[PDB]
Amino acid sequence: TRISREMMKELLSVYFIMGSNNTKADPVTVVQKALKGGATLYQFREKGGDALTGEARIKFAEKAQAACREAGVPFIVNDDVELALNLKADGIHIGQEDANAKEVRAAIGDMILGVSAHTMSEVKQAEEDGADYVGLGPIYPTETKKDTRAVQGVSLIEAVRRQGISIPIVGIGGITIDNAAPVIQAGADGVSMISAISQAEDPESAARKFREEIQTYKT
Ligand SMILES: Cc1nc(C(=O)O)sc1CCOP(=O)(O)O
Ligand SMILES: C=C1C=NC(C(F)(F)F)=NC1=N
């Protein structure tokens, strides 16, 4: 069957997202350090300019997935349903324009399904379509993606919970160790980030601090 709501919420705690172009250091090493530090979930997101393509992309994906397996953390693939199926990934994350969530849910069996949502209606539709979790953002100003909607703070998260919507939620967009707390307090089940860890001088320590911080506010 699909993942349980309870387990999904635990996995979203410290959700690290990264592609080879999000760090000036060795990509594979940064991922391994994030996992060693405490990341509870990892998403393979290789996009933008200078992104790896073809065999080079697959090899990185395979290495990232191996680090995830060895750390006992699920491996999520961004957008590429075919790759997710080919690599036997633990899940897939899709956006609003990328595909038809209902069709993706049917094609991936019981894999974890994540959908990016930005409005109340999108959140409700995602759950109805079969999503196991929703990614809401950008919470704070970001420069890593540079193709996001306007910053929305934690007001939408609060509104969703106020209505009684219980779907697992992860916040994303400009999240740092210093602004993560309010996201959890608003009702999110975790925080997702790229730069806060990928560009940190000490990725392992960064993930560790996030782990402790999220644990504290979820308690
Ligand atoms: C991939 C992505 N999506 C966003 C959204 O708002 O949907 S924000 C984002 C990435 C931002 O990375 P960082 O943690 O470095 O700000
Ligand atoms: C654009 C995105 C928004 N949210 C998430 C996640 F945090 F994983 F839900 N991933 C993305 N790729």
Side-chain angles (χ1 to χ4, degrees):
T1 72
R2 308 236 307 266
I3 186 169
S4 66
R5 314 272 282 200
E6 186 178 304
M7 186 169 274
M8 187 70 257
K9 294 187 179 180
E10 300 179 4
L11 293 179
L12 296 176
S13 299
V14 176
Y15 193 179
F16 181 44
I17 302 176
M18 203 195 86
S20 67
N21 55 320
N22 299 132
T23 179
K24 291 184 176 300
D26 182 65
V28 178
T29 296
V30 169
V31 168
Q32 301 178 312
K33 292 181 180 176
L35 294 168
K36 183 170 185 173
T40 55
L41 188 62
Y42 170 77
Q43 177 187 128
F44 177 71
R45 179 174 178 284
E46 188 77 16
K47 305 206 305 178
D50 195 64
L52 298 175
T53 61
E55 176 180 51
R57 168 170 172 276
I58 302 295
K59 299 302 175 186
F60 172 52
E62 301 182 315
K63 287 176 174 56
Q65 172 179 50
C68 284
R69 263 81 121 69
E70 302 186 59
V73 169
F75 176 73
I76 306 296
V77 172
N78 184 67
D79 291 333
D80 207 318
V81 180
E82 327 292 347
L83 176 65
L85 292 173
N86 286 167
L87 294 177
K88 294 296 174 59
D90 298 294
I92 178 78
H93 186 88
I94 59 178
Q96 291 294 321
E97 63 179 306
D98 290 310
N100 187 149
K102 187 172 178 180
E103 303 186 317
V104 172
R105 162 48 74 196
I108 65 178
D110 300 309
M111 284 173 41
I112 291 168
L113 174 56
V115 173
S116 301
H118 312 80
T119 67
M120 183 69 72
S121 55
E122 298 195 317
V123 176
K124 293 163 53 185
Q125 188 64 62
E127 185 168 6
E128 191 175 70
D129 289 332
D132 294 304
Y133 78 82
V134 168
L136 296 184
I139 306 301
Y140 304 100
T142 307
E143 304 175 55
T144 300
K145 197 184 174 188
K146 308 241 291 185
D147 52 296
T148 62
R149 302 193 189 182
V151 175
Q152 70 186 192
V154 305
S155 58
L156 176 55
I157 296 171
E158 304 172 312
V160 168
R161 295 313 192 206
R162 195 184 307 126
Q163 280 191 45
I165 296 170
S166 65
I167 190 177
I169 292 170
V170 65
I172 187 171
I175 292 171
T176 71
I177 181 62
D178 293 326
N179 61 26
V183 182
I184 298 304
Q185 293 175 302
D189 300 297
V191 294
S192 191
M193 75 301 296
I194 298 178
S195 59
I197 294 177
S198 74
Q199 292 166 37
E201 182 281 309
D202 185 350
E204 184 183 316
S205 177
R208 182 169 296 121
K209 292 194 173 186
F210 269 117
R211 183 57 162 154
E212 290 181 46
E213 178 81 349
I214 303 310
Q215 281 176 167
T216 295
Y217 285 87
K218 290 183 75 172
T219 300

